[PDB]
Amino acid sequence: VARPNFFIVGAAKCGTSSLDRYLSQHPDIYIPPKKEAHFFSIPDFPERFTGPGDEGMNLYTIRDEDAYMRLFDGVRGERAVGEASVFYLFYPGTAQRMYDAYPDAKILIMLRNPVDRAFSAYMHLVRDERETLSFRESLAKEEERIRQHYEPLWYYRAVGLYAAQVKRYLDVFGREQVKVILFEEFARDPVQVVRDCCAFLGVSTDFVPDTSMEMEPDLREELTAFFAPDVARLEALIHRDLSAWRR
Ligand SMILES: [Mg+2]
Ligand SMILES: [Mg+2]
Secondary structure: OOOOOEEEOOOOOOOHHHHHHHHHOOOOEEOOOOOOOOHHHHHHOOOOOOOOOOHHHHHOOOOOHHHHHHOOOOOOOOOEEEEEOOOOOOOOOHHHHHHHHOOOOEEEEEEOOHHHHHHHHHHHHHHOOOOOOOHHHHHHOHHHHHHOOOOHHHOHHHHHOHHHHHHHHHHHHOHHHEEEEEHHHHHHOHHHHHHHHHHHHOOOOOOOOOOOOOOOHHHHHHHHHHHHHHHHHHHHHHOOOOHHHOO
């Protein structure tokens, strides 16, 4: 009976889509074509997401255990089997539900400077014709959208405060079972980062994947300051320096 032994949990707009694509190419790794099932997050969801274009998080998510298990029907011989939903990191009860099902699971987290991540989410919403406001106006609506139960793609600030989200995974799974990757390193050398993930997942590292407009300056300064205390906490949690996020 095929089941997942690793999860790519987020964060959203951090480049996990490419990471998933590259890992899937490995002959010893299987990731189903379904993304954003969010099975382990469902109990943390509001009754329904109310924002424009939020239908997907209501409709395309998988809430039934049997349907979730069927995602893995395509596994054949792969040692590493994984599933990717980008708000797994954000919803606070997710790690514990996963652990209760799969205590030996490994967790991949990819993080990006949360200032850039926020702008990426904004650009995504604009491209999809969900948001017509300026980024400045869109930022100002976050509190009211959280109250109104919009989906988390809209929460520019909340989704970027990584420290507590990552701590929850480290607490539940332990440092042995969690690997945190920085988007900037992945962008610079995706082959190296993918090979590092192979080592983490315990599959062969002799693999080469086939890898084939501007925020207002005052907002960049203000958002950098907003996230700064959380970033400092995160540095201590993940044992590495984040100075690249302060430039
Ligand atoms: Mg494969
Ligand atoms: Mg613990």
